[PDB]
């Protein structure tokens, strides 16, 4: 019982782009760009589509960097999040009613205002590692348990 989602991090040598979500799921936190994958669409094509919808940016080549499964206690459906990176984009980030993009220097990543799992896997993303994770949450602020392992193949 899992549902597919994407998450894309625009990661350049000295800075990363995050978006502050203004409403709906994740509102009030910084995160990368993503969403649900459609019927008949590949995961990677979903990732590309959602980056455009949410940031204004056009990506060509996406690189796989992780898979993370999220469980909320009491909720039947698991989120199966496929995480991607890119360093090369076209366009300028767009602020919309849904999202406010900003660049962050890599020593100023706003962990306190991100989902709390990110403290665990973002350091791996920054060192170009790939990973499989599982995080069990109670509500949106507490991690009850987790596993996280580096992998060679996502």
Ligand X SMILES: Cc1ccc(-c2nc(=O)[nH]c3ccccc23)cc1
Binding residue positions: 6, 21, 25, 31, 33-36, 50, 53-54, 98, 115-118
Question: By Cβ distance, which residue is nearest to ligand X?
Answer: 115
The site that binds ligand X (CB under 6 A) totals a number of residues, namely 13
- Least Å from the CB of residue 84 to ligand X: 11
Report the distance separating Cα 37 and Cα 132, nearest Å: 19
30 lies in the site for ligand X, by CB under 6 A:
no
Query: Rounded to 10 degrees, what is the CA torsion of 70, 78, 134, 66?
Result: -80
Going by the DSSP 8-state scheme, the letter that residue 77 receives in this structure is P
- Least Å from the CB of residue 122 to ligand X: 8
Stretch that binds ligand X, among 84-92, 101-109, 112-120, 124-132 (CB under 6 A): 112-120
- Least Å from the CB of residue 6 to ligand X: 7
Residue 138 near residue 123, CB atoms below 8 Å: no
Report the distance separating Cα 56 and Cα 48, nearest Å: 11
Q: Which is nearer to ligand X, 31 or 55 (CB)?
A: 31
Q: Residue 91: which residues within 8 A CB-CB, separation 6 or more?
A: 56, 57, 58
**Chosen residue from 4, 20, 22, 26 binding ligand X by CB under 6 A:** 26
CA of 29: how far to CAs of 3, 38, 40, 147, 150, in Å? 22, 24, 30, 23, 25
Residues that bind ligand X (CB under 6 A): 5, 7, 26, 31, 34-35, 70, 79, 81, 115, 117-118, 137
């Amino acid at each position: 019982a899992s549902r597919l989602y994407t998450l894309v991090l625009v990661l350049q040598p000295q800075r990363v782009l995050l978006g502050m979500k203004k409403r709906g799921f994740g509102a009030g936190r910084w995160n990368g760009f993503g969403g649900k994958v459609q019927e008949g669409e590949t995961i990677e094509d979903g990732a590309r589509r959602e980056l455009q919808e949410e940031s204004g940016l056009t990506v060509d080549a996406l690189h796989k960097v992780g898979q993370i499964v999220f469980e909320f206690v009491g909720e039947p459906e698991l989120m199966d999040v496929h995480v991607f990176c890119t360093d090369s984009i076209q366009g300028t980030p767009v602020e919309s009613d849904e999202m406010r993009p900003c660049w962050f220097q890599l020593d100023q990543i706003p962990f306190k205002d991100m989902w709390p799992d990110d403290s665990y896997w973002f350091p791996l993303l920054l060192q170009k590692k790939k990973f499989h994770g599982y995080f069990k949450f109670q509500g949106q602020d507490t991690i009850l348990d987790y596993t996280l392992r580096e992998v060679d193949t996502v």
